[PDB]
Write a protein that binds this ligand. Structure first.
Ligand SMILES: O=C(O)CCC(=O)C(=O)O
Ligand SMILES: O=C(O)CCC(=O)C(=O)O
Lengths: 212, 85, 212, 85
């Protein structure tokens, strides 16, 4: 139904991916632009160690694969895009955009907003990672997960993602061991609860005020 | 402590009602405020600045003081102090 | 100048700023979009301590103040934009964009590219900050400064910016003391030279290959 | 070790010459390659993929082997090995 976005000149296509499936690998041609419709996509950089660093954790209505807008199919991806949860999205080869925009220029503004939003989200992760206190950095990240993926729940906001301590480690430039300890401290301070690998943050509004 | 998902900005929380229309703010440090209106279409968001949101909750406090209960006034005043002071 | 970009419906304006002058403060209405023409603009987050964290160090042809594309004049800035060097740029109030784009749709594509580039640049800082080794993180940052601000010089690429150890600290989530020590180590390893607060990186290509 | 500023992508370095067109790459880990052409207008950049840049330097090595000096061939081959192997 959202496919009302598509047309003769925006011949977009639906793709779905089971959890953990790759949307694009490094080295693939940057042929398409993506709109995440449902789920969470992880964009990461893989180093030769096999160590992965998460560059973005995208929520629904996120535009991604934007390198295609600079180089097109000629250049190669350097990030791994993976379906962190089951994912549904719309794909379109980027060459179809010029004539799309000319016909429905409402598409350009929508697009400009979506990219602007990406900029502000990555800058917030920069803020997160710039913290020297590793606990501050974790809280700030969990506050971003509450914003992007949170559900109201009896006790506060539950981050609606099943999160391994490794997945967190890879997003805040820490280690699995240091995440476990810091989550433990947060629970002992009665700031979060953990149930079935879901983190609930009890008073995310009041926590954020301590970051100003 | 009532919540709403903005398609672009993520989770928002309610600062207060007006009448009908509601004031919401971003979870992360209230960098953005939104006037929100509901309908059979229907939910719509208008950004507004922090100084104007402030004056809005201020007007609302004046209306509660004159026409509603002490409890509501006292609740909203606490919200004003945690949001703006 | 390049003010061939301007028109009746894109009534852009030139602003110049002496070094260290503010382009916008937190709290200012998000009225305008900016195109950096010459110089370097630092975008930072200021916390209540007076501690500053640099969210972006922008080079020429960078589009910034993009929050205006989402909210317009209604919302307030939350970053400090400052002229890190002397700066020249074009400003336009954002409301003028709709009718601008309708008339020269070539503006939309140019704009989409510019915002896409911002996304990729912030993501590279995320990569930089995600490094746990603080020296790796410094090298990665200096490699980014070589890309954005570097000049060929007898000995390698000279980062054409006069950089305080504090300015570096604020961009890599470190301390002034730790930057000094790490720069010292880099000089002693014959990987950089320092002259008049300019850092020269001797073989930036070969250094980058050690990050793959 | 010859350099060029792309307006969008920043500092590039030359991998090799062809004949008056050149192959350049991004400083940071060669994530992007660019075919570059010069003129009285005049400098223009065309992105190309890593596999196609590879085949380009390969073709160029074949031409140096047949028609130019050992030194040039040996220089370019070293560049091939540092860039692609
Ligand atoms: O859109 C993003 O942030 C992902 C970067 C990208 O476009 C790519 O690797 O092609
Ligand atoms: O353009 C940027 O990256 C700066 C963020 C911004 O637009 C703002 O604070 O208004």
């Amino acid at each position: 139904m959202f496919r009302e976005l598509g047309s003769g000149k925006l011949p977009l296509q639906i793709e779905q991916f089971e959890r953990g499936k790759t949307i694009f690998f490094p080295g693939d041609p940057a042929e398409r632009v993506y709109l995440l419709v449902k789920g969470a996509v992880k964009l990461s950089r893989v180093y030769e160690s096999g160590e992965e660093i998460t560059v973005a954790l995208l929520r629904e209505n996120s535009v991604f694969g934007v390198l295609s807008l600079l180089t097109g199919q000629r250049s190669d991806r350097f990030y791994h895009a993976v379906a962190f949860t089951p994912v549904q999205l719309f794909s379109v080869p980027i060459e179809f955009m010029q004539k799309a925009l000319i016909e429905r220029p409402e598409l350009a503004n929508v697009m400009l907003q979506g990219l602007s939003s990406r900029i502000l989200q990555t800058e917030m992760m920069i803020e997160t990672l710039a913290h020297r206190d590793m606990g501050s950095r974790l809280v700030s990240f969990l506050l971003i997960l509450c914003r992007d993926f949170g559900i109201p729940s009896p006790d506060g906001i539950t981050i609606d993602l099943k999160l391994s301590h490794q997945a967190i480690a890879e997003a805040i430039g820490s280690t699995r061991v240091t995440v476990t300890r810091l989550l433990g401290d947060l629970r002992e301070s009665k700031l979060i609860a953990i149930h079935k690998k879901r983190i609930t943050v009890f008073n995310p509004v009041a926590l954020s005020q301590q970051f100003s | 402590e009532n919540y709403l998902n903005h398609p672009t900005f993520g989770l928002l929380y309610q600062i207060c009602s007006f009448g009908d229309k509601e004031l919401f703010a971003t979870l992360y440090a209230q960098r953005l405020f939104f006037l929100v209106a509901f309908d059979a279409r229907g939910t719509r968001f208008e950004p507004i600045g922090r100084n104007e949101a402030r004056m809005l909750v201020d007007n609302r406090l004046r209306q509660l003081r004159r026409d509603a209960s002490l409890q509501e006034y006292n609740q909203l005043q606490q919200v004003f102090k945690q949001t703006f002071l």
